[PDB]
C-alpha cells in the first residue's frame with residue numbers, strides 16, 4: 001500500500017481533561033486520555049535513501065545483527081548487541097564515540113493486553129511491553145541533559161556536553177513487521193510551540209525506590225492529516241534498523257527531535273510485533 005490514514009494519539013491539554021505524567025509500563029498508561037487526530041502516513045519502502053538524520057531526523061538502514069533472541073534483557077546486555085549497534089551508529093553518523101544506555105523490548109499486542117488488564121489497578125505493571133501508541137519524543141531538550149548526567153559519570157558528561165552530542169534510538173523488529181509498525185514524523189513539520197515537556201516515570205521497585213525519572217516531549221495535535229509529515233516502512237525485517245533522533249545539541253537548522261508513535265494498520269495480521277529500541281548517546285568530539 002502507498003499509505004494509510006490512521007488515528008494518532010496527541011497531547012490533550014489539561015484544560016480539557018489531560019494529565020502530564022506518563023506512567024511508563026503501567027496499565028494506567030494504556031488508559032491515558034489523548035487528543036486524537038487522523039493523519040496520513042506515507043509508506044516509504046523503496047524510498048528510504050531519501051531520508052536522513054540531519055534533514056528529517058530519522059533513517060532506515062540495512063544492518064545485520066548476530067543476535068536473534070531479544071526477550072532476555074541480561075542476555076542482550078552482556079552479549080555483543082550493544083557493540084554491534086554502536087559500531088553501526090558511528091559508521092552511519094560519522095560520530096566520534098557512541099555510548100549505549102540500554103534497550104526496551106516490546107512484544108505484547110495492544111488490544112489483547114487492554115482486555116486482559118481491564119480489571120487491573122492503574123499502577124499495575126505489565127509483564128512485557130505493549131507498543132508505544134502515542135506521539136512523543138523520548139527526551140525533551142531538558143530531558144536529554146537530565147539523561148546525560150544520569151547515565152554517564154559526572155566528569156564524562158561535563159566534557160562531552162562541550163562538543164556536539166545527540167540521543168538516537170535504534171529500533172529493530174525481532175521478525176518481519178506485519179502488524180503495529182512504527183511511524184516517524186519529519187522533524188521540520190512540527191514547530192517548537194507544539195512541544196510540551198512532560199514527566200515520564202517508571203515505578204521500578206515500588207515502594208522501596210522513587211520511580212525512575214525521565215522527561216519527554218508531548219506533541220500538540222495537528223489541524224490537518226498532512227500538517228505533520230508522517231512516514232513508515234512496511235515489512236521491516238530484523239536485518240533493518242530505524243534510527244530515530246530524539247535530541248541534538250546542534251541548534252543550526254539540523255533536525256533536533258522526531259515525534260514518533262506506533263500505529264495499527266487495517267491489514268495487521270500475525271503474532272504480535274516484537275522489537276527492541278536501543279537508546280544511544282552519539283558524540284562528535286570535533287564539532288560545536
Ligand SMILES: COc1c(C[C@@H](C)O)c2c3c(C[C@@H](C)O)c(OC)c(=O)c4c(O)cc(OC)c(c5c(O)cc(O)c(c1=O)c52)c43
Pocket residue numbers: 023024025101102103104132138139147201202204212213214279
Ligand atoms: C528496561 O528498563 C527500562 C527502560 C530502560 C531504557 C534503556 O529504555 C525504561 C526507559 C528509560 C530509563 C529511565 C526511565 O530510568 C529511559 O532512559 C534511558 C528512557 O528514555 C525510556 C523511554 O524514553 C521510554 C520508555 O518507554 C516508553 C522507557 C521505559 C518504559 O516506559 C517502561 C519501562 O519499564 C522502562 C524500563 O523498565 C523503560 C524509558
Ligand SMILES: O=C(O)CNC(=O)C(=O)O
Pocket residue numbers: 106130131132133138169171182260261262275277
Ligand atoms: O516500538 C514501539 O511501539 C514504540 N517505540 C518507540 O517509541 C521508541 O523506539 O522510542
Ligand SMILES: [Cu+2]
Pocket residue numbers: 132136137138260
Ligand atoms: Cu519512543
